């Protein structure tokens, strides 16, 4: 089998670069290879096809390059919806083989999150159940960090964490954080906080609420 | 324009078998080769099969041969995928592609699980704030299985502050939470309304975000 | 099998902006083998340690080399601001990574001199409105734009390089000035390694 190696798994740059995305194949393939974009949605289109031929539909900002087993592919005047991820694939033996993907993150300005907490509903608490829920929406960079106080005191198990995909439209990055506890438990408390730590600020965003007070 | 559309997919035991299907339109299907490529939780991408136009013959990559059983129908335009035998290292998104030099098209995708896992169905619980020019609420998702579930609110309206978060995997069930932020003039003046549906265990309930009745 | 590191041993090696890059899977390598072949005068590694890297297994390894000066060791630093980490060279902030600056000694005898070091002090792009002055930050594992415009080798210490760019690139300018520092009697070097991990192989291990 022919082993497909992308450079890197990941790739970031500015509105207008110009942004290359290199692949090395395992033996001579002989020009035999193809790129491939799929966006944060899943769909996949082809972009060139042999090394360097555009496929029809796609912009002329998109190229492609390289011979034998080292081979290129090039965005210049890098566009918003040219976030998504990029794979690249042989075409000379079987059997046929993907390399394993170079994702593409486009620099935005920095941007705080939008910090959101939700209390348990009342469907959920009829079925002893108590999940607490905290929304970090839109904020760049990727990174984050979330804390959990419960009167006051730091709660690190029974968290459950998911992030988004960047952002196609506004590039930005949105993350949830959920305390699961019992309903014993749950109201065996009265105050819980959300902290979130993000670059933007020496100090954490914190939203909190409740239990009685509603 | 071409267009291809996988349909087929679901959740399975493993050892068992699943016929996935492909229909194309927008090109002569009887003159172009087809294959199939599917997109494992990883996203990594693998050759699954390929069939000749006639097609005189078939050719799959080792890990899938002897089991799978790439198909053909060029009166009625589609492709098929039988599997059988099937393991846990066959979980995938499932593309049907038209092939030749290259995969030049793509269609959305159908998903397959292979887990001895049960059918479950999904808890829906509102996300309303406690008690700014904009607002968010959203609808906790608990409980469901198998992968995938739709998220949507008032049925496709509401699109422009909406991003749907990843599933989490724990114990054999899944949670997502969905987010969706409006402005604070029409809420709760306009109803909004988180939409679930989970095919799988053919369950759709909807969910009204109605403001904390907080007494 | 064998991570071959040869291509460093031959030849004239580039300068910072143009690093080299080797690119190793599905092979067994010795990184003490080829440090020994040189006279290392730093090993700085981030996230990782100099022991670890010699000793671990990846999917991937990225070997950058290039010609260095030893008395710029300060503008490898991302600490910095410095027109070598800005315009020339900037490695994953994400993966393991360790920067080497060595001296090939008087029995290497295989590498050959450039005539002098040469790097980007400045690359920008100047707008269609021929007002507005825009720094290229090079990207990381990214070659900077200006590679297309400034040479192997700045001619003269000081020099600027233009390259009108199209209405596609979006028109202007692409504006280059380079920098040269004298050859050194021994020619000094820099080698940054970047290690990944990923769902398979066990492909880059050392070899016993
Ligand atoms: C090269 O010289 C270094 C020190 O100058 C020494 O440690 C090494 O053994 C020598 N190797 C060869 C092959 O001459």
């Known amino acids: 089998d022919i082993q497909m190696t992308q450079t890197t798994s990941s790739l970031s740059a500015s509105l207008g670069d110009r942004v290359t995305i290199s692949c090395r194949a395992s033996?001579?393939?002989?020009?035999?290879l193809n790129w491939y974009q799929q966006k944060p949605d899943g769909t996949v289109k082809l972009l060139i096809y042999?090394?360097?031929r555009l496929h029809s539909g796609v912009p002329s900002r998109f190229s492609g390059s390289g011979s034998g087993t080292d081979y290129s592919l090039t965005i210049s005047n890098l566009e918003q919806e040219d976030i998504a991820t990029y794979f690249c694939?042989?075409?000379?033996?079987?059997?046929?083989?993907f390399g394993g993907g170079t994702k593409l993150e486009i620099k935005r300005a920095d941007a705080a999150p939008t910090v959101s907490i939700f209390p348990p509903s009342s469907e959920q608490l009829t079925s002893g159940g108590a999940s607490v829920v905290c929304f970090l929406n839109n904020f760049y960079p990727k990174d984050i960090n979330v804390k959990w106080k419960i009167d006051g005191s730091e709660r690190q198990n029974g968290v459950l964490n998911s992030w988004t995909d960047q952002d196609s439209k506004d590039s930005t990055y949105s993350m949830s954080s959920t305390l699961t506890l019992t309903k014993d438990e749950y109201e065996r408390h009265n105050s819980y906080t959300c902290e979130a730590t993000h670059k933007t600020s020496t100090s954490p965003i914190v939203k909190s609420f409740n239990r009685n007070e509603c | 324009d071409v267009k291809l559309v996988e349909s087929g997919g679901g959740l399975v035991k493993p050892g068992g078998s699943l016929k996935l299907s492909c229909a194309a339109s927008?090109?002569?299907?009887?003159?172009?080769?087809m294959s199939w490529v599917r997109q494992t939780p990883e996203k990594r991408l693998e050759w699954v099969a390929t069939?000749?136009?006639?097609?005189?013959?078939?050719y799959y990559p080792d890990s899938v041969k002897g089991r799978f059983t790439i198909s053909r129908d060029n009166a009625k335009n589609t492709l098929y995928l039988q599997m059988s035998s099937l393991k846990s290292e066959d979980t995938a998104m499932y593309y049907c592609?038209?092939?030749?030099?290259?995969?030049?098209?793509w269609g959305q995708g159908t998903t397959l699980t292979v887990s001895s896992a049960k059918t479950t169905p999904p808890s829906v619980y509102p996300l309303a704030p406690g008690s700014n020019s904009m607002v968010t609420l959203g609808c906790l998702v608990k409980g469901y299985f198998p992968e995938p579930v739709t998220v949507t609110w008032n049925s496709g309206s509401l699109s422009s502050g909406v991003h749907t978060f990843p599933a989490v995997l724990q114990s054999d069930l899944y949670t997502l939470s969905s987010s969706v932020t409006v402005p604070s003039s029409t809420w709760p003046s306009e109803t909004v309304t988180c939409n679930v549906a989970h095919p799988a265990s053919s369950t759709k309930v909807d969910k009204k975000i109605v403001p904390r009745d907080c007494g | 099998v064998e991570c071959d590191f040869s291509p460093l041993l031959s030849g004239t090696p580039p300068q910072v902006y143009n690093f080299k890059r080797l690119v190793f899977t599905n092979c067994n390598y010795n990184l003490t083998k080829l440090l020994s072949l040189f006279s290392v005068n730093d090993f700085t590694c981030s996230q990782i340690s100099p022991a670890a890297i010699a000793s671990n297994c990846y999917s991937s390894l990225i070997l950058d080399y290039f010609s260095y000066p030893l008395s710029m060791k300060s503008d490898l630093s991302v600490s910095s601001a410095g027109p070598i980490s800005q315009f020339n060279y900037k490695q994953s902030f994400s993966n393991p990574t360790c920067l080497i600056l060595a001296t090939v000694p008087h029995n290497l005898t295989t590498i050959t001199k450039p005539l002098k070091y040469s790097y980007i002090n400045k690359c920008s792009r100047l707008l269609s409105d021929d007002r507005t002055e825009v720094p290229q930050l090079v990207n990381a594992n990214q070659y900077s734009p200006c590679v297309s415009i400034v040479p192997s080798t700045v001619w003269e210490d000081g020099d600027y390089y233009r390259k009108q760019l199209s209405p596609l690139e979006g028109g202007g300018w692409l504006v280059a000035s380079g920098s040269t520092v004298a050859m050194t009697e021994q020619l000094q070097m820099g080698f940054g390694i970047t290690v990944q991990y990923g769902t398979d192989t066990n492909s880059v291990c050392p070899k016993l």
């Open positions: 592609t038209r092939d030749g030099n290259d995969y030049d098209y």
């Open positions: 927008g090109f002569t299907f009887s003159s172009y080769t």
């Open positions: 069939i000749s136009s006639g097609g005189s013959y078939t």
């Open positions: 033996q001579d393939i002989s020009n035999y």
């Open positions: 042999y090394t360097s």
């Open positions: 694939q042989q075409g000379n033996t079987l059997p046929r083989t």
